[PDB]
């Protein structure tokens, strides 16, 4: 396994402050079941997303189903069956921060894992139970795929 997260989101606002770049746009999705936020930047040129689209977003820790935890180098010649074969947009990033509503005494209820995909940021701001397998400085995949419903 290694599925740190899994859900259905739907684009609720596309680049809202105005488009800052040209091949990259902010998607402000919301979730459907766990009721999470998402702020994603996608390569809007090779994978275009329009408003009201729904996609299944699986944040995974590895790509191989058995969870054998690859190294972090790119080797294209590989037979092993992956999870990327049933998705359309796969990214690979590094969680760089985990903010939360901790107080000094009791624990936190809402977390925010900020991961960064080679420069293209993401923030999965939810509640502190779905954000469990996320610890700062760890490599993570994105795996999203548009639902044609």
């Amino acid at each position: 396994a290694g599925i740190l997260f899994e859900d259905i989101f739907d684009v609720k606002d596309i680049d809202p402050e105005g488009k800052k770049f040209d091949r990259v746009s902010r998607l402000h999705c919301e979730s459907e079941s766990f009721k999470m936020d998402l702020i994603l930047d996608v390569n809007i040129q090779i994978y275009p997303v329009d408003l009201g689209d729904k996609f299944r977003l699986v944040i995974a820790s590895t790509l191989y189903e058995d969870g054998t935890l690859d190294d972090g180098e790119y080797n294209p010649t590989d037979d092993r069956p992956s999870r990327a074969d049933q998705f359309e947009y796969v990214m690979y990033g590094k969680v760089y921060r985990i903010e939360g509503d901790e107080t000094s005494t009791e624990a936190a209820t809402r977390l925010s894992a900020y991961v960064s995909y080679g420069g293209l940021l993401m923030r999965l701001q939810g509640d502190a139970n779905n954000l469990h397998g996320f610890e700062v400085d760890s490599r993570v995949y994105l795996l999203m795929k548009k639902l044609a419903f």
């Binding site: 259905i8 459907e32 079941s33 299944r56 639902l147 419903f149």
Partner: peptide, 12 residues
Amino acid sequence: VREATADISDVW
């Protein structure tokens, strides 16, 4: 089933 429509009371 969930992916097509998950807004049916049964799948939840």
